[PDB]
Amino acid sequence: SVRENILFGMGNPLLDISAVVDKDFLDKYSLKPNDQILAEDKHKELFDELVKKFKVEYHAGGSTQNSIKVAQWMIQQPHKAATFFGCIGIDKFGEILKRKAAEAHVDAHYYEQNEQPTGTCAACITGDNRSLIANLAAANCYKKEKHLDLEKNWMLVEKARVCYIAGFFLTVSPESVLKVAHHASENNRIFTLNLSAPFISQFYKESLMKVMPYVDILFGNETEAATFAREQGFETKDIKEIAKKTQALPKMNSKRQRIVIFTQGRDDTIMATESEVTAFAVLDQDQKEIIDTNGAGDAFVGGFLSQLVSDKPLTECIRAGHYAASIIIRRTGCTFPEKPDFH
Numbered sequence: 001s002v003r004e005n006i007l008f009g010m011g012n013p014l015l016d017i018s019a020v021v022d023k024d025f026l027d028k029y030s031l032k033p034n035d036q037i038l039a040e041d042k043h044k045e046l047f048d049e050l051v052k053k054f055k056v057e058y059h060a061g062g063s064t065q066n067s068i069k070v071a072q073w074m075i076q077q078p079h080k081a082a083t084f085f086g087c088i089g090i091d092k093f094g095e096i097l098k099r100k101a102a103e104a105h106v107d108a109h110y111y112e113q114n115e116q117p118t119g120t121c122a123a124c125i126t127g128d129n130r131s132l133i134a135n136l137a138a139a140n141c142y143k144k145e146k147h148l149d150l151e152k153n154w155m156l157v158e159k160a161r162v163c164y165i166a167g168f169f170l171t172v173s174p175e176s177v178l179k180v181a182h183h184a185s186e187n188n189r190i191f192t193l194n195l196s197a198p199f200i201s202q203f204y205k206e207s208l209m210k211v212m213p214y215v216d217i218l219f220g221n222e223t224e225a226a227t228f229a230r231e232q233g234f235e236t237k238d239i240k241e242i243a244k245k246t247q248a249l250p251k252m253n254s255k256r257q258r259i260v261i262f263t264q265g266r267d268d269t270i271m272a273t274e275s276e277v278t279a280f281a282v283l284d285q286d287q288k289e290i291i292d293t294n295g296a297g298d299a300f301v302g303g304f305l306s307q308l309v310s311d312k313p314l315t316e317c318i319r320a321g322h323y324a325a326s327i328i329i330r331r332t333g334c335t336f337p338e339k340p341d342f343h
C-alpha cells in the first residue's frame with residue numbers, strides 16, 4: 001500500500017573486499033582489529049596486497065546502500081519502493097553494484113564516470129574482529145549539480161516520505177545532503193541520518209552539526225554515540241543521557257520532534273524522544289558468533305526504515321530493525337572464486 005520511491009537514500013556505493021588476515025597485516029598498516037576508517041596514503045598498498053596475499057571475497061557494500069536494500073527487502077511489496085543515488089566508475093565493480101542493486105529491486109540511479117574507479121571497502125578480519133578501510137575513489141565524485149539537481153533525478157527525491165543518508169556521505173557531499181535535508185524540512189518529510197562511525201564526529205563535525213538541525217531521526221551505535229558526546233562536550237558516557245541531550249539539539253522543523261536511536265550490539269537499543277528514553281532488548285539471536293556488528297547495524301536501520309515508511313509505531317519500527325538484524329547476515333566462505341587458481 002506504499003508506492004514506488006517512497007523511501008529515498010543516497011551515499012557511497014562501495015564493493016566490500018573481505019578476507020581473514022593476520023596481526024602482521026594489521027600492524028604493517030597500523031590498523032586496529034575492530035574499526036572503520038577512510039584510506040590515507042599509507043594504505044594504498046593495503047589493497048593490492050590484501051587481494052594478492054589472502055583469500056578475499058566480493059560483496060556489494062556501502063552503508064546507506066545496504067540499508068536501502070534491506071528496507072526494500074522488508075517492504076517487498078512494490079519493487080522500487082526504495083531509491084538510491086551515488087557515484088560509481090565505469091568498470092567491472094561498477095557493473096556488479098548495479099546488478100546487485102537490480103536484484104534487490106532497488107530503483108538505483110548512479111552517476112557513472114571514467115576518471116575514478118568504483119570505490120571499495122576492505123574488511124580485514126581477524127577472529128571476530130573487523131577492521132574496515134574504505135577507498136571511496138569514485139563514490140567521492142558525487143556532485144549535486146551534475147546528478148541530484150537533474151530533473152529526472154531530483155524528481156524521484158520529491159516522491160519520498162522518508163529520506164536516509166548515512167553520515168559517511170558527509171565526507172563526500174555535504175551540499176547534496178543539505179539540499180535533501182532542507183527539502184524534507186520545507187515539505188514536512190522525514191529526514192534521517194546515521195552517525196556512521198567515530199571519525200564522522202571527530203573530523204566532520206562542521207558538516208554534521210550543520211546538518212543536525214534537519215535530522216528527524218538520528219541513528220548510530222554506542223561507540224559513535226560516545227564519540228559524539230565527547231566531541232559535542234556532553235560530559236557523560238551514559239548512553240541514555242547521550243540520547244537525551246542529542247534529542248534536544250537545535251531543530252529546524254518544529255512539526256517533528258527529534259528521535260534518537262542507538263544500537264548496542266547485543267545489549268539494548270536506546271530510543272530517546274521528547275517524552276522519554278526507552279530501552280529495547282534484542283532478539284535472542286544467540287550462538288550467532290560470527291556476526292558482522294557493522295552489517296548488523298545497517299540491517300537494523302533498513303528494518304526500521306521499512307516500517308517507518310508506512311507510519312507504523314516506533315516500537316514496531318524497532319521490532320523490524322531487530323528482525324532484519326538477525327536475518328540479513330553476511331558470511332565468509334560462502335561464494336566460490338570466479339576463476340580457479342590451480343595452475
Ligand SMILES: C[C@H]1O[C@@H](n2cc(I)c3c(N)ncnc32)[C@H](O)[C@@H]1O
Nearest residue numbers: 012037061062063121134168294295
Ligand atoms: C559494514 C558496511 O559499512 C560500509 N562502510 C564502511 C565504511 I569505512 C564506509 C564509508 N566510508 N562509506 C560508506 N559505507 C561504508 C561497508 O562498505 C560495509 O558495507
